[PDB]
Amino acid sequence: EGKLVIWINGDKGYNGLAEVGKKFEKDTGIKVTVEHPDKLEEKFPQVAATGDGPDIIFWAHDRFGGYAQSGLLAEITPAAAFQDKLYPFTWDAVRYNGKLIAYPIAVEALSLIYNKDLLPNPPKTWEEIPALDKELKAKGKSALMFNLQEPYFTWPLIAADGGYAFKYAAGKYDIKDVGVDNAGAKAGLTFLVDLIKNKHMNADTDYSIAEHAFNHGETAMTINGPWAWSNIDTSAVNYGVTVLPTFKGQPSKPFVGVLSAGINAASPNKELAKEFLENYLLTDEGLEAVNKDKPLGAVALKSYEEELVKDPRVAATMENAQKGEIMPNIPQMSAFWYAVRTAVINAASGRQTVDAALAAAQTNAAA
Amino acid sequence: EGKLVIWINGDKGYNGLAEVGKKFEKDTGIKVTVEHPDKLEEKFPQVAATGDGPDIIFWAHDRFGGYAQSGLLAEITPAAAFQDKLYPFTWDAVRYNGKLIAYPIAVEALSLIYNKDLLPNPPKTWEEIPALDKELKAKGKSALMFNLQEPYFTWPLIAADGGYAFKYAAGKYDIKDVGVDNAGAKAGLTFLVDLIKNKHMNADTDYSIAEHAFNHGETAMTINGPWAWSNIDTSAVNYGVTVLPTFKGQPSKPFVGVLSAGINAASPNKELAKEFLENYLLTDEGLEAVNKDKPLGAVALKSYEEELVKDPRVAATMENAQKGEIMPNIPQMSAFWYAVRTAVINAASGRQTVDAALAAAQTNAAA
Amino acid sequence: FHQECSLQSCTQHQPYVVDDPCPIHFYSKWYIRVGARKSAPLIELCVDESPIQYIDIGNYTVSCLPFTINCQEPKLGSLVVRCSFYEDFLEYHDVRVVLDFI
Amino acid sequence: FHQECSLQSCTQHQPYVVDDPCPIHFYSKWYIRVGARKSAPLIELCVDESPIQYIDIGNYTVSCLPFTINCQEPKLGSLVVRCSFYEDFLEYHDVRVVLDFI
Ligand SMILES: OC[C@H]1O[C@H](O[C@H]2[C@H](O)[C@@H](O)[C@@H](O)O[C@@H]2CO)[C@H](O)[C@@H](O)[C@@H]1O
Ligand SMILES: OC[C@H]1O[C@H](O[C@H]2[C@H](O)[C@@H](O)[C@@H](O)O[C@@H]2CO)[C@H](O)[C@@H](O)[C@@H]1O
Ligand SMILES: *[C@@H]1O[C@H](CO)[C@@H](O)[C@H](O)[C@H]1NC(C)=O
Ligand SMILES: *[C@@H]1O[C@H](CO)[C@@H](O)[C@H](O)[C@H]1NC(C)=O
Ligand SMILES: N=C(NO)NCC[C@H](N)C(=O)O
Ligand SMILES: N=C(NO)NCC[C@H](N)C(=O)O
């Protein structure tokens, strides 16, 4: 084809990525087109299963194992000198059945974000958030709002006291060893359900409601990632990004996602995609253009991450990532995600008790 | 809102409809916007179930009973003088549970379309098409290609010897009285399956393949409706539109569809929509603008139909419509359509015998 | 023809996988019709996707997949499953589920 | 964990509604794997929606909804159902159906 088409989410810096694409075009004459369709994680396997779609797709690594089991991603073989420029665990996140299947770009972990003017000393523990909400309610504010509809956002608390997704043993993930209904998950989800019964949170809070509340000074804290920093920046809320609160003395364990660039297996521009990702994007200047447009948070290129970690928001992202767990990439993550999503929302809205919701989600996810 | 939004299929004359919309705008200042989204018959109930969507949707009447059972369509009450300007059976097709729920526009029926240069005397019977295909094959041509993937296109032959959808008795349709597995349907579908086994038709022929073949002089006949005339017009194939062939001495009985204009129940411009449809579109000049853009075939306004019937294509549409059956509009048409669609394609492609496919489709459609 | 009622037998106060009355190629979604009054609202027992509010359903729903209840009459009202046709969500019918205790 | 094989019993040469081995919240689509050879193609028994060609399956498939066969081993090969997860068609598994005749 002689052209590069790239798919990346719309909340990321696609204009900066296109600048790296323009420079690639100046050096090679190959036009680079950047698009941000809705539901890429769904659109790509649809269009790529018929042999069509973009050359390069950007998405969290946990989806790519389902891609690779159906042969949608090209295997990459970067030189050892290039692999060393990235943190070794990121390469592990994009390995499927022994093959590297994407290029790591960014390392994502949720953090606590707090309104400095409402709350200059944000709490260190989950346990003290109820009393803090009781206080702020007498002022017409609330302590904490975050997206309860996606289990990615509740997992940090659920996993803190013992919860886990798929156990890693002997170089593989065990489909039958799931930890969503153990004692730590039950205690984590019970705390959240108690927040709702005691009216410190509403069961219908989603991404948009929680973002609008925090960005308009109505709530003192939220839980989000680097993709949300831009909207707070223009909102003129004076905010900080810090370590997630502990639960029962244990750190919150956010899921760690590696934003990664996978090459379509059906692409006829495979070598140009490898050229663009290695020699243009995965450099200090390439990552800077994307990060300048919209912040990536922490990155997998160690040379540029050593520059970004000076930003305390990125430092907090790193610290939360170190306390968290890499998402498995196995295809059963879809049934895992659906199992945990339904259980959390059913417990949050009173449709099921915590024990019943987690037990049934355990059975389905481990099936 | 003070504005009119209209949804109509893309193969119809939406530019002519917009001209009627411009004239409505000159007389009232109300801007009329015409759009042709893909899958309106699916998009509308989705967006209208949440209280949104266009003011006016154009679609075959058989879908509107499912719309009306969920309260998506406004009831219309046109003056008796206006009702008389349309053929009474069209009003019956847009009545649901005693309420008129749309304005009839066009009356659609399938016809036989033949290449005059390849076939100046098109056959009168289905039974002589095998021998005609055997002849044209020695010239590298075929006798007949039409969309086997949609049961609307196979129904004329299926119903000719006795097949029927839902029986009309005592002012209502009987959900439990379905006629897709009687002797006439079995004989009709067996003839079609025999056409495929004897290699006079292919089981994968769809709308696009059949249209491309006929419009490029590769096949001598096709079965289609007025929405297809435009593409043959610019194709420079010398074609005629005539009565469908008989089967076992009986006329083919095409389903009769009434293209109808329904008003969104959630629309705030209900009176403007009624004004636009009655006093602007449903006139000789309004229908002429739409028909001039893309032909409607026969129409429900008797004054303009008396003008269109001079066109022999429209005359053939009328004759085929008189020999056919009005589609029921009951919500079970969706399970009927799916039942017959799966049975025809399974029999056409050898997955089921005719008797087995029709028997199982009878059970499901009458459930 | 689809039945309006579905009479089923289970041992009271013990788990019971409900026999799904929806036909094949129909989606099943379970509700409680408040007070068994047809003019009252439907409470969804399994939140898939529109304001969601906390309602204590107690121990009623053991699991949503497969739909499993602690065998009992619901306090909030009647148990209803809505059967929605795969190809068209506008073709739907409701079945009331009624329990005979063993 | 999902079984790879499903052993079922039916009276030979009589209609039999196949017990669906796919879990709840998985779509079932039935195939014949030609010659029971894993490298051979899959023939769909129920054409929903990609070149379709005429293949005489004979009397094998009595109905597609519910999936019902004339109880027999298929001549063309092994009977396979592909179970595809509702939320993600990339999470799928195949179950081979094997018949013991009564
Ligand atoms: O909630 C399940 C969901 O979690 C992750 O999605 C994250 C994503 O990684 C982040 O980049 C950001 O967009 O927030 C998302 C949560 O809404 C998994 O990557 C995703 O597959 C999974 O469905
Ligand atoms: O095949 C079932 C299908 O038949 C009818 O659709 C017609 C439509 O009425 C015509 O205007 C034209 O577009 O051809 C269509 C067939 O593809 C029913 O109206 C429709 O609901 C039904 O699904
Ligand atoms: C569920 O709660 C009800 C409360 O009315 C009780 O009667 C029943 O025994 C309980 N079933 C259990 C705990 O299995
Ligand atoms: C189906 O056809 C096979 C042909 O091999 C035959 O053995 C079997 O008896 C038939 N079953 C019927 C007609 O029910
Ligand atoms: N008929 C076929 N394959 O040959 N269906 C494949 C569906 C499969 N789950 C996929 O998306 O890869
Ligand atoms: N929860 C509800 N209604 O209150 N669901 C309604 C779904 C119904 N079949 C429809 O589209 O009309």
Residue numbers in the entry:
A (entry chain A), B (entry chain A): 12 to 378
C (entry chain B), D (entry chain B): 16 to 64, 69 to 121
Give the authors' words.
The ORF8 protein is a unique accessory protein in SARS-CoV-2 that plays a crucial role in immune regulation, but its molecular details are still largely unknown. As a viral Ig-like domain protein, ORF8 plays a critical role in mediating host immune responses. The SARS-CoV-2 ORF8 has evolved the ability to subvert antigen presentation by downregulating cell surface expression of MHC-I. The structure of SARS-CoV-2 ORF8, containing an Ig-like domain, allows it to bind to MHC-I, potentially mediating immune suppression and evasion activities. SARS-CoV-2 ORF8 can strongly bind to IL17RA, a key receptor in the host cell IL-17 signaling pathway.
